[PDB]
Design a protein around this ligand. Structure first.
Ligand SMILES: NC(=O)c1cccc2cn(-c3ccc([C@@H]4CCCNC4)cc3)nc12
Lengths: 196, 200
């Protein structure tokens, strides 16, 4: 049930990408579009079979529920070096997320621009100057402007409270961040290690 | 497909249905006996089978993953969860969410709590009685897997060895020798299989 472009594996692997290959170049270009002042050390493909299976089941469900296939975005997530081993194995856990400086809900935050996740607040430099940013497939689905009190996405309709938006954002006209409130709604696909 | 169980009834191509069980038939009897083993003084108004296809699919995926991870198929337990009436629509559609509001204490970790005996979930503090005196308890398939003793402040189960901090226990409990409650810390580790509506 695994993608054909993964290396043959074991249930988990990190795969170092080669510059000049299209897969590496597309990630670098997306990163450099707004992060021209940093320099990438390496880009690794996260091959996590269990996280992939759970995420893809959730994506198929959202595609059915919403009756279209533009539920997924490729977003960024900066984090500290100490969180990287957990995210590689277990993904993003809302119960560990820090509070965002503009909070649109209690969940895991993903950024449209790498420049946002490049802030030392998120991708905290380690003692060797290395900063860490995931590139994440995120099931954003149908979204609305969040509120700091949210622990789940809000209902679309107050008289049917269990029929929920899939995620929330900071601005529905010009989205710069998305917040997801459920496990396996985000698959960490690449880990960018970079430096000033 | 969704690998739906054989005992579910036809849903006319729909994906979520609550099906009221027929008293006196084998399925109703099995669930009622698990309840009355510790709650024989309560009065059961009805038992509903929760047929949530998306919740079931995601739960079975995690079960297959846990069965491979632990290299055995003894990772599931049938447990009880009492809750207030206003939370039943969410649980039916979405399962158990560690993040939701609650006044109850989280002495063994910030997860969702499941009881071994129905009589524990029958307390008013969990199955809070209705404006009409009715109480609600789920019978839950729970992926307890390999467990250890819990403690306050856990946000995930602890690792099974400090040297490999990402290899975690699957759940925690109050007492490993003789468990009375289990706590799980992730979505789709618990499928709500039947809803028991009852009175004291
Ligand atoms: N059947 C039950 O619900 C149950 C049986 C035995 C012990 C239990 C403990 N709880 C419990 C229920 C809810 C909570 C928290 C309260 C704080 C917010 N998130 C839910 C913590 C513990 N539920 C129990």
């Amino acid at each position: 049930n695994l993608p054909e472009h993964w290396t043959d594996m074991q249930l988990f692997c990190m795969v170092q990408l080669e510059p000049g290959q299209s897969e590496y170049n597309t990630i670098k270009d997306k990163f450099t579009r707004t992060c021209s002042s940093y320099a990438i050390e390496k880009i690794e493909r996260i091959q996590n079979a269990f996280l992939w299976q759970s995420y893809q089941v959730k994506k198929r469900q959202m595609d059915i529920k919403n009756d279209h296939k533009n539920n997924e975005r490729l977003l960024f997530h900066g984090t500290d070096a100490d969180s990287v081993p957990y995210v590689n194995q277990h993904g993003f856990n809302r119960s560990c997320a820090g509070k965002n400086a503009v909070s649109y809900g209690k969940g895991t935050y993903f950024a449209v621009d790498a420049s946002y996740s490049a802030k030392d607040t998120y991708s905290k430099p380690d003692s060797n100057g290395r900063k860490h940013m995931y590139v994440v497939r995120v099931l954003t689905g149908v979204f609305t402007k969040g509120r700091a009190g949210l622990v789940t996405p809000p209902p679309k309709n107050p008289h049917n409270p269990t029929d929920l938006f899939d995620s929330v954002t900071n601005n529905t006209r010009s989205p710069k961040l998305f917040v997801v409130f459920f496990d396996n709604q985000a698959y960490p696909e690449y880990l960018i290690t970079f430096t000033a």
